Every structure is written in structure tokens, then in C-alpha cells.
Design a protein around this ligand. Sequence first.
Ligand SMILES: [Mn+2]
Ligand SMILES: [Mn+2]
Ligand SMILES: [Mn+2]
Ligand SMILES: [Mn+2]
Lengths: 279, 283
Amino acid sequence: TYTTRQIGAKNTLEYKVYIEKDGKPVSAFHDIPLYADKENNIFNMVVEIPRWTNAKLEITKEETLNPIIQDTKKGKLRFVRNCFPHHGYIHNYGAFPQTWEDPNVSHPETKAVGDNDPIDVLEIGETIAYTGQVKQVKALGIMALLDEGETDWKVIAIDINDPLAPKLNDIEDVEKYFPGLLRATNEWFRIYKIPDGKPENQFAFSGEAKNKKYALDIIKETHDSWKQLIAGKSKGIDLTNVTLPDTPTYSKAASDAIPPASLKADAPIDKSIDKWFFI
Amino acid sequence: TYTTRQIGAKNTLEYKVYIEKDGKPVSAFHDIPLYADKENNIFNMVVEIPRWTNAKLEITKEETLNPIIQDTKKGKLRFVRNCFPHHGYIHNYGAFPQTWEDPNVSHPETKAVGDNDPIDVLEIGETIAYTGQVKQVKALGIMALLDEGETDWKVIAIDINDPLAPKLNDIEDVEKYFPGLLRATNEWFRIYKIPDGKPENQFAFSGEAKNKKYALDIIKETHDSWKQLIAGKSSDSKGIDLTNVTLPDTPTYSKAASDAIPPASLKADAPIDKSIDKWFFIS
Ligand SMILES: [Mn+2]
Ligand SMILES: [Mn+2]
Ligand SMILES: [Mn+2]
Ligand SMILES: [Mn+2]
């Protein structure tokens, strides 16, 4: 059973969320199996940002046991701005554990390097998830956002327990049940950084969302890169783990060094984050 | 100064918010001046629902001092559903105090009776307001939603303190600074009840948002209806509680009313059912 250990108050710099497996903290990056069901291609997803929120929370490669913390830009906490007609993130946003986009690898079709982070996942189910949640999702497709010369893949997935999960099998089904969701997703990733002074993002494949088969190839590749990394002969990435004995960095002691859950009430978010930008 | 007196926990049947003027509760419906600045046409708006929320909160006509409380349907709390691509209400939603849409009267250009409530206001500024807040806004235009045979006017306004306020003077300016906002507003009011089993709503004037001048005419009219209402001169007042504490010349004036309202009993927001999360794709 996976649980979360919050330390600090949300919307502050002290905020950290650790994932626990049966009460013991494990690495959010390395210790959660990519597959919940390997033969059926059911994956485990680590949710970082709940739908309709603004705080840019993400798994930290830099810290031990890789807890989820809020991104900062030179001491200032990072929030994504509201871009009409959207409110914060429009999907439960997260990543697939045990995956890594090797920045040394260049994809032939996209012609851009990996982004050095676990592959990104957009979960489109009805329920709003919580930070640090481990959901089991089925992959349906994948888009390729080009950002700063790196291939920023975004897997489209859905919680297997969503009442519609059984009806959705491939990318085409998303447009059947969530008409317009893909166009909005495309729009969102093209403009979300504009309020930050950045220019619009480009999409590979002319913005086409590739299907499940294609998605699965890219996922396996990033899983392999991660295996290469976590294994003996492979940066700044902390590779400490507590569930993989065959790895140079394995360490059960790591779990116990984690300070206890220190749940505090959410700190207020600045009123400027309310603003709706019309781009 | 205007403050709010919360009683109960948000998202519960016990929830109530009273507006206070210098510490004493006043009627949200009758006691707040329609005009903040009569000369320049700056109005006072009572905010009921903050942008991006779902709870259908509104000034209750059938209770003393007319506090804001959550609408209910079949003994259950009422929430508007999320309709793609929108999240809850897309504007800070509220009403103009001292206005009333007389239900025993049909407007000439829309041919339907009034909806029996203060005129509705859509405040489009950047800051998210809070329930029971009294903002000063300038009117820019007005739309006419036809719902159940009643003219449901929606005034388009903006907080006088908004960074872009002076740039906005008439309905055409909204489309210049908030492109697409008006089309989304139309879309939203046409479909928001569909998830509830209701059919889509119709729009008078082919969905055209009338300009400022037109808006001011309708506002004046509803203010007059209210004056005839609060003076005891309405043919049918509809069970509306007319108790007030600031208008001595009215039959229902009563200073004593203020003191009878129970003290602020702030409690932490009750949780909202997960089903409210659902995004409906109505195409
Ligand atoms: Mn990521
Ligand atoms: Mn990425
Ligand atoms: Mn109303
Ligand atoms: Mn109305």
C-alpha cells in the first residue's frame, strides 16, 4: 500500500511529500514499479499536480528518496499562470516512475534530446487526484512537445478505475468521450509559458497525438534508459533506493533517516496567481 | 466599512453570511446603496459566488436581513457542474442590491416577466472575490438570458480597482481586452443547466450583449421596482422579507433587527462531494 508523508505546509519552500510503501518511505523515482500489471500494460503513475491547481510541484532528482517539492526560480516558488479559458493545469499531472529521458539520446523523428526527467503523464479521468498519489493507469496515446531543443513527451492516460476506463482503449477513443480535450491540451502546452516571458512551444508530428502502440515504444525506451542508469556502470541525480538490492546505491537505511510526517495547514497563495491571461 | 459575519461551515445547510456595516448586520438586499457614486454611475455589487467555484450561493429573500445561503434542491445542497472547458462559474457572480425584477411585469423588448430577484451581475476583473464582498463596479453592458419564460438579465461589470478598469468604458472594450470572454459567457449560460436535466437556455437579441447605455436603463427600472417594493406599494411582494435597518421612511424599518442576528460562528469548510469534480462535455 502506498501512502504519503507530508512535511511542511503546502505552498512554501519547506513542503516535501514522500511516498511510503507500507509505512516506509521509498524513492518516488526508483522504488515504485513502472508496471502494475506487465502483461496488461497497466502502469503506476506518480501524481505531482492535481487538476485545476497552479503550484508547479515535481519529483526531485536531487534529493534522497526523491520527494515531490515545489519548483523555484532563484528562491521564488513557481506557479503556472491561468490562460483563458483554462484554470491552472487541465489534467491530473505526473510521471511514470522508473523512466528517464536520457539527454544524451536524440530521437530520430523528433530530432531533439531527452529532457532528463521521468516521462510526463496526463491523466484525464474525472476525479481530481492528490499530490503523491500512486494511480494505476492505462496508456492511450502520446504527444511530443518540443521545448528548448528537448523532446518533451506527454503520455495520455486514464485511471483504470475511472467509470469510463473500460471504454477507452486507444487515442481515438479520447475524442469520442472527451471531445475537444486533445485540442485544448495541445493549446495549453503551446501557450502555458508565454505569461512567463517565454515564447510558444512547438509540437512534433504537427501536434498529432500518436496512438497507444507508439506510446508503449517510447515508454519502454525510457524505462531502459532508467535501467541503464540505476545499474552499476551508468549528472546530479540521486540514485539511492531501498528496493533494488542489485544496484550499487541500494540502501535500506535510507528509509529510516526520513523525518516524520509534519502536516501543517496550507500556506496562502499570492493573489496575483488569480489573474486570467488572454493569449 | 462593510464586513461579513459567517455563521456555520461553508458547504453545509447551516452556512449563512450576513453583511455588516460598521459591525452591525444590515440587509444585503435592502440596506446597501445601489450607487457608490451616483454622479459617475459606480454601483455597489454584492458578490455571492467567487470565480471558479461550484456552490450555488445566493441572497435569500425569505429571511430577515437577507443573508447569503446555499440554494438547495430536494433538501440537498446545490452545485453547478463543470462544463468543458469551464471550471465552475467563470466570473465573480453576484447582484446589485436595491434592485428587483418585478415578476408581475413583462419587459417590452423581451416580452417576458421579471425573475423576482435582484438584477444579476457578472464581474470580470482579475481578482477572485469572496462571498459577501461589497465591490464598487462600473457597468459596461448587459445580456438577456431567457429562462423559464422570465427575462434573466446579466449585467457585465468590472471592479473599479481593476488594473484595466479605466481602459474599459463600453461593451466593445471587453472584446478588446478579454477576447473570447463574451462568447464563452454566452456558451456558459446556454448550457450550465443541461447537466441538471434541463434543456439549453435561449438568448434575447440573438445573444447580443447590449451596451452601457442600455444596461443603465434596465438597472434604473429594476431600482424603481425595488422602491415600489420596499415602500409597501407592490401588488404582490411574493413573501419577500422587507425588514431593513437603514430606511426609516419604510413600513418595515427596524433598528432592532441588527441585534437579533447571532454572532460570527466561523467553522472550517466542510468537504464537497467528489462528484462535483466531474467535467461534462456538452457539445
Ligand atoms: Mn515532469
Ligand atoms: Mn518532460
Ligand atoms: Mn441572482
Ligand atoms: Mn436574474
